[PDB]
Amino acid sequence: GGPVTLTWWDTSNATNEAPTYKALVKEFEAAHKDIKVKYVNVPFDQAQNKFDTAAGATGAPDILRSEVGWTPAFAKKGFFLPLDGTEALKDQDKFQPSLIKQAQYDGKTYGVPFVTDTLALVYNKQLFEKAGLTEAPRTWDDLKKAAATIKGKTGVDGYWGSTQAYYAQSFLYGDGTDTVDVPAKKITVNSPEAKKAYGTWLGLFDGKGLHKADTTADAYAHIQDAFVNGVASIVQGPWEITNFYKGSAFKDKANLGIATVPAGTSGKAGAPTGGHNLSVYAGSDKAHQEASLKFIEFMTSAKSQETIALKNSTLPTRDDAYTAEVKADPGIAGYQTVLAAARPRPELPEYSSLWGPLDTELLAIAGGKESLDKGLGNAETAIAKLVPDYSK
Numbered sequence: 012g013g014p015v016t017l018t019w020w021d022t023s024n025a026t027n028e029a030p031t032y033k034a035l036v037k038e039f040e041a042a043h044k045d046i047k048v049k050y051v052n053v054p055f056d057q058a059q060n061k062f063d064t065a066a067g068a069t070g071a072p073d074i075l076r077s078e079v080g081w082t083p084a085f086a087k088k089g090f091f092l093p094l095d096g097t098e099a100l101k102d103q104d105k106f107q108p109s110l111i112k113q114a115q116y117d118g119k120t121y122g123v124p125f126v127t128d129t130l131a132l133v134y135n136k137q138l139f140e141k142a143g144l145t146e147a148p149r150t151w152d153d154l155k156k157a158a159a160t161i162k163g164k165t166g167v168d169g170y171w172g173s174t175q176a177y178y179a180q181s182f183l184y185g186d187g188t189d190t191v192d193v194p195a196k197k198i199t200v201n202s203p204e205a206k207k208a209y210g211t212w213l214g215l216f217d218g219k220g221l222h223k224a225d226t227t228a229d230a231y232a233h234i235q236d237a238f239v240n241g242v243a244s245i246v247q248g249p250w251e252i253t254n255f256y257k258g259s260a261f262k263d264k265a266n267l268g269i270a271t272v273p274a275g276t277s278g279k280a281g282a283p284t285g286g287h288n289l290s291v292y293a294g295s296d297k298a299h300q301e302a303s304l305k306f307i308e309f310m311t312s313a314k315s316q317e318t319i320a321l322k323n324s325t326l327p328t329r330d331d332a333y334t335a336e337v338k339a340d341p342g343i344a345g346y347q348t349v350l351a352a353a354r355p356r357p358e359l360p361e362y363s364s365l366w367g368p369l370d371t372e373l374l375a376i377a378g379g380k381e382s383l384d385k386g387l388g389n390a391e392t393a394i395a396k397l398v399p400d401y402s403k
């Protein structure tokens with residue numbers, strides 16, 4: 012009869028975010044001797060499928076850094092334990108209520124808001140200043156023109172957009188639409204507004220200053236390597252702030268300009284809301300569940316979140332965690348303003364599963380393998396399988 016051996020499957024950045032969390036794991040083990048936590052970093056791309064496999068069978072973890080979109084999905088699948096009336100939610104009033112709504116499923120909370128974020132048009136102030144530009148482009152049409160001016164002046168590419176569906180979601184919000192209509196229940200991916208929205212996204216690869224699409228699976232890493240070293244601007248979240256400062260372009264932290272994503276035909280801009288929630292596995296024995304409820308209370312404390320914000324530059328979920336040290340950081344202050352345009356996700360557990368087919372079909376459209384209506388038509392049929400309550 013020794014201590015309780017827990018296992019936390021972390022999905023954060025292994026270089027920037029993991030060291031900060033590995034330090035908090037030791038702080039909990041130092042204060043609580045009867046509990047031991049086994050740190051395991053699982054790549055984000057594989058974390059959803061790996062947990063879905065393990066949760067039903069054996070080798071499942073006790074705690075999981077679940078994404079805000081996977082929490083209602085795994086809560087629907089019965090893998091997560093409900094945290095209503097537990098020591099993990101002792102400070103339920105301190106968190107943002109909108110983030111507690113994302114963790115909820117069928118009127119019951121299955122996760123504790125750990126971190127939060129949204130995409131934002133990050134840019135290089137030196138290259139924009141050298142190109143005779145003061146402010147960031149307000150619309151997608153201004154971004155196309157701004158890139159050609161930056162290319163003509165400096166000779167560096169003005170913009171390199173991501174081929175992924177999560178990043179392409181900002182265009183649907185820009186043109187006044189979404190992937191699906193939940194109240195009416197209908198697939199709006201092959202609709203008038205989506206065809207135009209994706210048409211604008213597809214148009215941002217071709218042009219002077221605009222970098223062409225990359226069909227590789229690791230395209231994401233090329234977009235960081237380019238922007239960190241010095242491409243003029245990209246659409247990215249706050250989790251790469253620490254990664255940006257490591258590069259040669261952003262030695263000066265003030266050089267990193269953070270503006271809201273440009274708007275479309277709707278007038279106002281829009282970006283997808285994200286983040287992660289800590290959630291306990293229901294199949295674990297009652298001993299490990301009680302020990303895990305204590306870990307989440309500590310990990311989502313005012314002290315821990317305030318520390319995490321200073322190290323990782325990620326936005327805390329608690330309102331009390333925003334001190335002057337946190338507000339003084341350029342990154343956090345810059346992303347708190349763009350958070351105004353972050354569109355919350357609707358009450359649909361399969362909403363995140365809809366990006367799966369889109370990531371495949373959009374990479375075909377961007378790569379020049381299929382036409383625009385070809386891929387969107389296939390995505391509309393592939394989406395209908397995962398959610399047949401629409402129809403098209």
Ligand SMILES: OC[C@H]1O[C@H](O[C@H]2[C@H](O)[C@@H](O)[C@@H](O)O[C@@H]2CO)[C@H](O)[C@@H](O)[C@@H]1O
Nearest residue numbers: 022023024025055078128177250285286
């Ligand atoms: O790709 C969409 C995805 O982006 C963000 O996920 C990050 C996350 O901050 C960390 O786990 C990081 O280490 O890697 C992920 C890479 O995507 C958002 O946090 C997430 O909501 C969104 O689905």
